[PDB]
């Protein structure tokens, strides 16, 4: 018998919200009778914009070649880069010969204020050379990014791909536990690259991350191994007409600074496991003498 709708108290504020009763009076004895778009044409982003009339687009206050702080407004009405020439023998012929030492770039310099400033986007023949690089929603570098009962564990310990059970690498225990005593159950997250099972206790993790960069299983090559120093950043993979190439002819003191496609300009060389075994024992021997 809570009965909340019966009592409303309309004489004062109502439902957290305030009504117009405070603004319904005007008797005081104090003075004693004496177009625009959501997105942008420069970076395709939403935010603060300046109103325009000659053009139907909107630009940011800090996305212009002569940028101006929003607090100090420009005098009059501001116009875009090409809006200046929008209202207004060819001028190219005299412009080419007007200046010296710029003749091959005269036409390129002519077209500077005839178009709007914009953020930089990589061309249509750069990103796609590496299949790992894909365009983002707003222009991000996309490489790998996208409290209940025990029922989390059956939803994670069974992938229904082959009707089997995934076992962790550090410990050979799935540890699904029992329904009566679920405290012995351990959550397992799988890898997003090789689907390697991993307990949440073996690797120092405490939560599942599903927004942002995908979790990496720590059984791969380091991305930024540090040894003044050296910052290895790989050489990526090339899918453009098999440009990466495969030339196995030496495999000895190769010194190919990593980046091997192991088999049983840029050049992802081919390596075998016999060579890896041989030069491992060679390095072990040379460490034994020193």
């Amino acid at each position: 018998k809570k009965r909340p709708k019966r009592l409303s108290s309309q004489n004062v504020n109502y439902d957290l919200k305030r009504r117009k009763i405070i603004t319904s009076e005007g008797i005081e004895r104090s003075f004693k009778n004496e177009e625009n778009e959501d997105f942008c044409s420069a970076c395709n982003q939403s935010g603060s914009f300046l109103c325009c009339d000659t053009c139907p687009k909107s630009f940011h206050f800090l996305c212009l070649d002569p940028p101006i702080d929003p607090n100090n407004l420009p005098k009059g009405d501001w116009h875009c880069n090409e809006c200046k020439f929008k209202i207004f023998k060819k001028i190219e012929s005299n412009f080419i010969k007007q200046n010296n030492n710029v003749k091959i770039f005269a036409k390129l310099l002519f077209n500077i204020d005839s178009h709007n400033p914009k953020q930089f986007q990589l061309p249509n023949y750069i990103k796609e050379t590496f299949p790992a690089v894909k365009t983002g929603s707003r222009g991000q570098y996309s490489d790998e990014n996208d409290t209940k009962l025990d029922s989390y564990n059956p939803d994670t310990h069974i992938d229904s791909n082959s009707g089997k059970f995934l076992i962790c690498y550090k410990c050979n225990q799935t540890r699904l536990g029992s329904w009566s005593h679920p405290e012995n159950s351990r959550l397992i997250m799988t890898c997003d690259y090789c689907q390697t099972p991993w307990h949440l206790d073996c690797v120092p993790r405490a939560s599942f991350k599903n927004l942002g960069s995908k979790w990496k299983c720590p059984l791969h090559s380091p991305t930024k191994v540090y040894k003044n120093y050296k910052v290895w950043k790989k050489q990526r993979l090339i899918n453009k007409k098999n440009q990466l190439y495969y030339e196995p002819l030496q495999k000895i003191g190769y010194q190919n600074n990593g980046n091997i496609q192991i088999i049983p300009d840029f050049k992802i060389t081919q390596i075998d496991e016999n060579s890896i075994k041989y030069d491992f024992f060679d390095k072990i021997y040379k460490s034994k003498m020193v």
Binding site: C194, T196, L219, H220, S221, G258, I262, E273, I276, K277
Partner: peptide, 24 residues
């Protein structure tokens, strides 16, 4: 001896999805 590493790794890892990364 120092040549038992190969079949030790063959028994332990087994699958080539990780063994190749172990070789790397």
């Amino acid at each position: 001896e120092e040549v038992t590493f190969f079949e030790k790794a063959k028994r332990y890892i087994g699958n080539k999805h990780l063994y190749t990364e172990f070789l790397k």
